[PDB]
Structure 1
């Protein structure tokens, strides 16, 4: 219903700093023109699910799940291509909009006939074991340390208990700290001194071993359970990534290779999807950091992986071209660098402009 105008006072009381009713947002007239043309109309929500959004998303919520998760600000930012960008993109701190879709996962004991549901306990720690109090992991709008009291739906026990994850983190911290898949049961009994605790956790690999960051590609992650002493430190999980890569390329085809640890396969569903969305700035397809100095070969043209590379690196391609031209091998240098690097630049920076 309609009432008198009080936007500015409430806005500045929310922000608690001297702003203006439209100084925070410039209304981006051409950008919002194109946005109202394609996105800000019904179309992106048309493609959200099925025919439309109000009378069709509710049946989806009632049957299996609603798409209310996976906030849209990531996609709106990643397609709209706003103007007021900072220069602290790659160094300093990340955009803090990274969101990974934890589609499924459960703490099903298996031995017990009736599964007991436990919400995800985002226990944040370090390689050395730093506390990581309310100051570090929260601050982006995520207080999920207290997410507990899991009650099953009326029909199916399988669906997980995942929600929005928001982290305000820096490059040094993402280099250092680590997080675990803890599941502490919040039973009806008030006392938490019983033996209903988490039987195991799994750590999160923030950067791939070759130097690549988190990736959007589908890599379901499992957990490994056991005594608390073998996972209270980080070295044991540091040397055991517990990812899909080691199950085949490490010659770990036999599931009994681990002395005590057991993957979730044939134990619990634990389909932990990884999705480094387009809004992220650390996306990496081919490892450019070797391309700087320790480049084994010119495998970055035939296997260039011609994806975006939105220039958050700060001049990687042109500096590498400068060094390669200094090398003075032969024609293939120039032909490759031209026809791939300026290919990508003239195919992405055009939309950037």
Structure 2
């Protein structure tokens, strides 16, 4: 790109406070040649094939700390090329030739070369590398664009972090789908040379139409309809570890999947274009329970057989795309012997991916949706309430509003079962405890926004007051001790919620026919506080101190 050379400026945002304090950070550049598979002159070779070349690594931990910050400095990151050492030393081996070996100088995945360069602080650059001026500019994207407009303008490229910031701003709308092709074992079959396998990611909808420009090779580059992985020269188990960006509409990614097409590149172009994808896997970007794909690793299953069947969304999507799905279908087919015949196309070939979903609306939890589906998941609400506390707060704060509303609706419709009231009480206590943390403190304003605007309860305050009054009355219980103590820690917004429900009652019923009763409830609640506190202190020194707090 002739218009980029003077504008090749990369800026890595989201580098949180913990990002700087990381003891070891490296600026790693992946160098992959695109073009002919073999550097041979005499025959046409398949162009556009990606082959590993080398990796340049510099320990920039001190730079990210800001120990050195100067625009004029041009840090020369040395470039280490892969060890294709089969031409120099071979000319001197006499008087004892006993060797039967092959040439492996390009087949090594870039992960091994990267590990070697990391281990070897000295890089055998031999005059090959790249110059970059490295600096840390404090602040987020915007204030770097403003306080450092000269260095970083709107034409400067932008990259985001593999993770989440310490402060998730209310409204950090993102759909960062980082799909990393970790590894895949593909059978050679009848081909004596190991199949040159490439993961040509193909994002299709449930109808099979390929989504254009939905896959992004990396930062500073626009999306592509299909991303082609690194071609590995006759490798049985090509390891890619290629972190590529997928940006689907967060509403469309619920109706979007990624199909993973694996094709064989022979050394010849005619054989390349005459050979179809012998195997095709796919990942369903959302769980069968209505939640998006879980953050972690997914072991895809490579398929074999009819090409049209393999590429028809109506068929392969129905097939289990992952080994976990295969096991789940196999186990569910054991109990019901009703038209369940395993296919012989389930070969040993499989694929592995890693999906780091940095999203604000995408949900990853069964219990979360079950509670959100409580009106139809009434059979699990007892279990959903018990098992939502284990759910991390990161996904919870996405739809904390709807979680609250679902809990309050549970209270309204079936307040008869007080056990569910206790479970909702404890879950809400945990909710406020986790939101009050530094990580989610900025969503407390959003929580208050829900309370003052979207809160829709007229008598839940009664039940919450009853439960907390039982909490204070049963204070001496040790099992309650942590629970009541956490409620005490989460009291402020608790009573804000109760007061909002009470005033909602007031304005929908005009005058409180139970204003005396509500003020009473407050009376015996304070009296329960008093009978808590007049108890001998040796049981609850901490609880009394926190109460005063």
Give the TM-score normalised by the residue count of structure 1: 0.50
Conserved 8 A contact 2:218-2:244: no
Conserved 8 A contact 1:199-1:225: yes
Describe the shift of the 1:117–1:239 C-alpha distance in structure 2 as closer, same or farther (beyond 3 A).
same
How many residue pairs get matched?
350
Offset at 1:165? Answer: 0.9
Gaps of 5+ in 2: 1-79, 430-549
Moved more, 264-273 or 331-340: 331-340
Conserved 8 A contact 2:182-2:239: yes
Conserved 8 A contact 1:121-1:182: yes
Offset at 1:92? Answer: 11
Gaps of 5+ in 1: none
Offset at 1:84? Answer: 15
User: Secondary structure of 2:162's match?
Assistant: coil
Conserved 8 A contact 1:148-1:185: no
Cα distance in 2 for partners of 1:21, 1:92 equals 62
Describe the shift of the 1:116–1:85 C-alpha distance in structure 2 as closer, same or farther (beyond 3 A).
closer
Offset at 1:229? Answer: 1.4
| 1:45-67 deviations in Å (ceiling 9; x for gaps) | 99999999999999999999999
Conserved 8 A contact 2:261-2:280: yes
Offset at 1:182? Answer: 1.0
Greater strand content: 2
Moved more, 139-148 or 312-321: 312-321
Cα distance in 2 for partners of 1:309, 1:12 equals 68
**Of 194, 209, 232, the match for 1:130:** 209
Offset at 1:198? Answer: 0.7
Conserved 8 A contact 2:173-2:360: yes
Offset at 1:199? Answer: 1.7
| 1:102-130 deviations in Å (ceiling 9; x for gaps) | 22114433233321212211123222232
Offset at 1:98? Answer: 2.6
Moved more, 58-67 or 232-241: 58-67
Offset at 1:100? Answer: 3.5
Offset at 1:174? Answer: 0.9
Identify which of structures 1 and 2 has the higher relative contact order when contacts are C-alpha pairs closer than 8 Å and 6+ apart. Answer: 1
Describe the shift of the 1:97–1:156 C-alpha distance in structure 2 as closer, same or farther (beyond 3 A).
same
Greater helix content: 2
Cα distance in 2 for partners of 1:60, 1:157 equals 46
Conserved 8 A contact 1:91-1:171: no
Describe the shift of the 1:303–1:179 C-alpha distance in structure 2 as closer, same or farther (beyond 3 A).
same
Cα distance in 1 for partners of 2:133, 2:365 equals 41
Cα distance in 2 for partners of 1:168, 1:192 equals 34
**Of 301, 304, 307, the match for 1:222:** 301
What's the C-alpha RMSD, in Å, of the aligned pairs? 17.9
Offset at 1:38? Answer: 24
| 1:277-318 deviations in Å (ceiling 9; x for gaps) | 374445645335644553279999999899999999999979
Cα distance in 1 for partners of 2:418, 2:168 equals 28
Describe the shift of the 1:326–1:138 C-alpha distance in structure 2 as closer, same or farther (beyond 3 A).
closer
Paired position in structure 2 for 1:301: 380
Describe the shift of the 1:106–1:273 C-alpha distance in structure 2 as closer, same or farther (beyond 3 A).
closer
Describe the shift of the 1:59–1:149 C-alpha distance in structure 2 as closer, same or farther (beyond 3 A).
farther
Offset at 1:166? Answer: 0.8
Describe the shift of the 1:24–1:101 C-alpha distance in structure 2 as closer, same or farther (beyond 3 A).
same
Conserved 8 A contact 2:215-2:226: no
Describe the shift of the 1:117–1:24 C-alpha distance in structure 2 as closer, same or farther (beyond 3 A).
closer
